Design a binder for this molecule. Structure first.
Ligand SMILES: Nc1ncnc2c1ncn2[C@@H]1O[C@H](COP(=O)(O)OP(=O)(O)OP(O)(O)=S)[C@@H](O)[C@H]1O
Ligand SMILES: Nc1ncnc2c1ncn2[C@@H]1O[C@H](COP(=O)(O)OP(=O)(O)OP(O)(O)=S)[C@@H](O)[C@H]1O
Ligand SMILES: Nc1ncnc2c1ncn2[C@@H]1O[C@H](COP(=O)(O)OP(=O)(O)OP(O)(O)=S)[C@@H](O)[C@H]1O
Ligand SMILES: Nc1ncnc2c1ncn2[C@@H]1O[C@H](COP(=O)(O)OP(=O)(O)OP(O)(O)=S)[C@@H](O)[C@H]1O
Ligand SMILES: Nc1ncnc2c1ncn2[C@@H]1O[C@H](COP(=O)(O)OP(=O)(O)OP(O)(O)=S)[C@@H](O)[C@H]1O
Ligand SMILES: Nc1ncnc2c1ncn2[C@@H]1O[C@H](COP(=O)(O)OP(=O)(O)OP(O)(O)=S)[C@@H](O)[C@H]1O
Lengths: 290, 290, 290, 290, 290, 290
């Protein structure tokens, strides 16, 4: 029902659909405290905004930054917040603004915020935000400065309107590189920390929850052996274990075994061997370093 | 037994026949690790799908991409997987979709996936996938955009149905050209690497396996001298050697030699000379470059 | 009077004739500033070259690229420049170089520039230049690389000769796809922009100039209502209006009306209804998108 | 009253007679929108040309191409336009130009257009236009090239004369085969589409209009059952039904029935059985395919 | 001794006789490298097939295509291979399959391959192969599709039988027109190139070999002056020279010259004048083009 | 004569040719002191290295960095040094290393320095060096770290070998962004400063040196009025002046002026007006800022 210019139709294409996203609060673990903080601060003003207006403050923050090591679940939480918020979420990947030839860039940068302002409430997200305004070339440097100026001016415009309903969000793996202008902005900042021992156990429980598992698995030992890994690496370790079991099954089946079609369930030794091989992969990477 | 529209009958024509294909796992070498990975990941869920459903994951990937230099055996492995999988394989060459005149295009793009969905399990393949959605003309640009949108929408539809049984596959020689939409899709990606020294020796063994060969041939030297070549070039080098032997035989026979009808077997010097001439052909190409 | 090889006779066939082309400077509107820039920079050195040689610079650019959305008049301006320049113009459509079988390709790529160099001054044009060197197949990839190398080498040859008199030109609808080699070449680049409100009014004046029009038509309202369209769509909108008037005339004539043979002139309501129906067609396209 | 050379008298023989043609606008159905477009664009300028000259444009198109699957009524509409236009219509079947021996060919190709130009207004038609310039032999290839060059040159001549009054038309079943030269020509192109459900019902109404029919026939069911057919096949299905009724009549009459000489009128069951047998014929063709 | 159906007797009529063919390897020049390749690849497996079976490969190719400009000797080499191979050669001119009325077509297409399979080894040839499956008419289109399907199915049947001994061959002047199905077939392809300077000298030597020639003729100059011609044109140029000498002889004899009955031998000036007149004929053709 | 791996052949393609570069010491002005420093320090050890080895020091620096505002001539001086040095110059644009998919990256980074080490003496250059090791993505971050480590390790390797003959060079517009690792490297650093009043006058003299100029031009006033510009802007200002003169010439010629074909020479008022218009362009940019 929104009225659009060619620019705003271009932005409308990047808008995500809440009916095709998958992840939810039920599909996240190991961050539940940060989950609680993010939910309470961001989602609550978004969903029922009029409730929180009787205050100069606790108005939804004009900037949210997620910072944490790679593989800690930053993109996962971005998607989960986008879906669970129930609002409109724009994924503003860098190519959207680094228009190398067209003066169309200025109106396009304007149109991003224009569509966001039309669609109230809505959330803007920038993955790899450190790279957002850095690309340079003979045709881009002056245009890069113009894009910088326009983006901060429109951000200040969002700040200026007391009736604004839109938030801007970002993620990054090496956040120190962020420009001082960003550092002065993005007031509220949430650390997506690596999972501790208990958090690692929670992560393993979430992953294994709908795997085929023998009840007598003990995970805390797996939690210790996995302490060197990140969340994505935890996922990939459960991967190596499952595929290892599948390999041994297929190799045993070929030797004239009966066609029962049933597999050995996940057992402690499986994850032990998988973790050893995962550490071997890390060791290959380290030898490449050494 | 399938019920078809004119579109689906048109697609049914492109469907390959598992009774006329030749190549098998017994006719591939130098990639056995990638062969193992492809087999385990793709074929196993395809053949006995119900076995792998007790998991949110290890479900057959929604996209498989093969990337490797020309002549490394990408088409060979595509055919080998198609036959060995035992499923239905559709070869979706570009002309199938670049309908330049008929609005029939939309229904045809729909019918490809329609037939694939009817035929469960089945695999879709696109050779030269980089060129799949690039052809342009005065009558094609808008239709090209429509085809793009429809193909990704139907791909998302395959993703949406948890009961989907169909995979889509692609190959390409210059894969960097691939559109970012493809890059975001095709999660699992297998590198068809060039044969290393040991892999090259394996390739030569496979080729010579049913040639007429003197046992005292030594190949590792041939492996080193062939290191500059690709697999197709290895094949063509064995070609030049065999034909060279045939030429010398016929020239010796004409000079009043007895009609014994027996040829000199493959010997080291034959492949040495053939490889030298092959490098001479490469040198002619290089001089054309220079 | 030129001496030709079979290749150069093949190229000579594609050469356009300045006596059968139609469009002129008198038949172009809405771009007059870009028209002025193109005329001054390109045509002036072409026609009276010796005038501009007393300078290391302002020599005709070694590459001209036209970039603008579809329907903005890129082909029209290409033809207009070709005719008005009075020089020889070669339309180098892609099929000229994508010779799929003959080694004739190399000599053919050479012959294009050979004929251009013989015919001084002359202009080379490549519509859909992005597709110029992209077509690929089992028989084409290596030949594609050879064609690439030859074309840039001959372009560098044109650059090398200070007495060169030939220009190369190109057009494209999605120019970002252009190879970085092209981006490094084609120094002077002209944007064929969409018509603004005043430019749109000029376009409508040009189209209606020799239509049958009632003087009391007001166009600025038509200019606003047409702002969503492109130039080709402006042309097609005047189309729908004229044909609508013809339809109502023929339907009124059949009902025993006198045989006066005179039609209702173009009036505001005609274009209003035609524009509404044109927007309805755009709406049908949008619903197909939605 | 025209003055003729032997060539032009030969062409004059192929000219059709508007007093012996049968079909009219009253004898066509299922295409009425395409009928309207063709009528408005082609016939109106033809009949009262001076009316449309006060425009650079909407002048009768220099080429009309009809493309549609076999049996969709392309020849029928060609004849209907020829008669209803009231102009002179030349049926230029391929043999007219593939003169295998006589240098008479050149003057004959000239004479076709010569007679057309003398006879203003007139329409040239080429059925199976894809085959028009393809026949080859030891005595024909060079002559084939000459014929190609002459035909496009004379077509360009028709384009050149602003006072030209003649149109050229063509039809084809596999139009993709058309040479790129044709594709660049023939600007206006009309799709003779297959009849949709409503169009199929209209076709059946047209066919049955002057058959002997019981009023309680219901056709929409026949329309659905006939959806697999083409227009010619619809005609042939009404054929099988009528002849089936005649067969049962004659077989019932021979058994000492009274000589009343009256037949069972067309009823639903008749067309049901006829359509079943028609689908059986299609099934025999399919089994031949299978 | 073969057992035949009416169809196979009809095909047996087209079979050529190795005792009435003329041309041989001793009567071909200017292609000796392509001659060597064709001989080695085709003839050797044909004549002594059991010699080459100890290999999955170097089995006679399932398709040979000859492509080259008109007059380069394609038919000559076809005949030479047919005779020198010593096998049975079938000349499958297009009329053999374009049966316009009889359902006999299907069995006839079957019978071609049936006789070929009975007669082992044998070679099938199709001149003007591009026209092989293109002829169309109201009575032919569906039959054309049936013929296409049958021919590729029987070709696949030849591919399927590892004991097959028959080859299929084709020639064409404009081979790009070939259907993609053919392009996917016919693996081995030999280019019948135009004669280069040395090849042209060889051609002239072959032609003059048994003419009456003065030893002091120099041909390399004739080779340069003839470079614009093709092989057939070289033959026809030697023609014009010989007939020119005969004309001058007869004109000198009539003027009361003695009845010695001896002619001036071929000398340089004769071929010089003949080549000038030949170029004059080419010039007349060019002026017709211009 | 160098022996190359596929990687080193890929690098060999980027190597520039000293026979096609244009600029020289004779084509640079306004930096002659920095020119002298660069020449003495870099070129002298490069050309006659054995002369400078009798010292632990004044060995060619292991890193040269050029830093200056955009348009000050950094690329010009890079090219001038590359040509005048007479050595081999590699232009290492960022895409060479940001290989997004292939493990080929590691060997490619090695091959850059490998070819440089083989080709002694040679100079490596990185334009936009700040962006050299910054690009990031899901597939690049770990590879980015690996590339960083490899590049500094190979740089340390160049430092380690006392017989090293290769230099590495870089340029950048916003050099503060440079990583601290770079800051610790690149010992010798040359500032490409903006032209002062005298330097600006020298720049104008260089540009006008082979323009058509009236001797009574006074430049110091032009030098003051141009003080706000950069070198590229100085060039573009001389541009606007020359083109302005050409425009007035062409407009005066059309009005029935005699065909003398002579233009008004460059005069003070021309540059005055051109500079005013240039400042107007700067003012438009400023208003966009404001
Ligand atoms: N706490 C968690 N709960 C569930 N999944 C997690 C968690 N942490 C990480 N993951 C997994 O990590 C994956 C991807 O890693 P992410 O950290 O979300 O991506 P990322 O943060 O963008 O890393 P990069 O380097 O920026 S691409 C998903 O497949 C998640 O399942
Ligand atoms: N590992 C291998 N084992 C057996 N044959 C191989 C192998 N690698 C390459 N080949 C041969 O390579 C051939 C064709 O090369 P492919 O790499 O399969 O085709 P391709 O990948 O499509 O190359 P292009 O450039 O895309 S056509 C076949 O004849 C194979 O026998
Ligand atoms: N400024 C203009 N003045 C006159 N005609 C114009 C103008 N802009 C567009 N047109 C019309 O646009 C037509 C064709 O559109 P073009 O833009 O020239 O073709 P194009 O740029 O090649 O578009 P594509 O997508 O590349 S085929 C012609 O019929 C012109 O009359
Ligand atoms: N819409 C229609 N109205 C009336 N008759 C139709 C219609 N469509 C097809 N026909 C019948 O179709 C017949 C012949 O088919 P056509 O399509 O006109 O011939 P065609 O297009 O040349 O087919 P081919 O394959 O080219 S011979 C005539 O007998 C018509 O009566
Ligand atoms: N290398 C050659 N050696 C001998 N005769 C040749 C040679 N090349 C061409 N000819 C002559 O060319 C003749 C006929 O030309 P061909 O090329 O064999 O026929 P073609 O290839 O079918 O041409 P078309 O256009 O297809 S009929 C014969 O009379 C040959 O003597
Ligand atoms: N001192 C100078 N002498 C001659 N030409 C100069 C001088 N300074 C700048 N230029 C001109 O400046 C041009 C390009 O500007 P450069 O400064 O060399 O490029 P640059 O340093 O890469 O700028 P960017 O922003 O990095 S693309 C060339 O056309 C030179 O002619």
């Amino acid at each position: 029902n929104v009225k659009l210019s060619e620019y705003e139709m271009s932005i409308a294409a990047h808008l995500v659909d809440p009916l095709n996203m998958h992840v939810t609060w039920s599909d996240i673990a190991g961050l539940d405290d940060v989950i609680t903080d993010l939910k309470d601060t961001v989602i609550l003003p978004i969903k029922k905004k009029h409730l929180f207006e009787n205050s100069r403050l606790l108005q939804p923050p004009k900037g949210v930054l997620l910072y944490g090591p790679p593989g800690c679940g930053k993109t996962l939480i971005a998607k989960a917040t986008a879906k669970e918020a129930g609002c409109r979420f724009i994924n503003l990947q860098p190519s959207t603004l680094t228009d190398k030839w067209y003066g169309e860039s200025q109106k396009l940068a304007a149109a991003v915020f224009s569509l966001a302002i039309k669609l109230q409430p809505s959330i803007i997200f920038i993955d790899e935000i450190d790279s957002f305004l850095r690309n340079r070339s003979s045709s881009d440097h002056e245009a890069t400065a113009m894009m910088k100026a326009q983006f901060m001016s429109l951000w200040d415009g969002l700040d200026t309107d007391h009736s604004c309903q839109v938030i801007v969000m970002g993620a990054t793996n090496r956040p120190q590189d962020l420009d001082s202008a960003i550092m002065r902005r993005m007031p509220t900042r949430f650390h997506i920390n690596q999972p501790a021992l208990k958090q690692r156990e929670a992560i393993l429980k979430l992953i294994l929850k709908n795997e085929n598992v023998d009840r007598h698995v003990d995970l805390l030992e797996v939690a210790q052996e996995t302490d060197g890994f990140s969340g994505s690496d935890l996922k990939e370790m459960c991967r190596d274990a499952a595929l290892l079991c599948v390999r041994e099954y297929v190799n045993s089946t070929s030797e004239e075994s009966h066609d029962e079609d049933e597999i050995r369930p996940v057992q402690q030794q499986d994850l032990h061997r998988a973790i050893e091989k995962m550490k071997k992969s890390k060791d290959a990477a380290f030898q490449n370093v050494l």
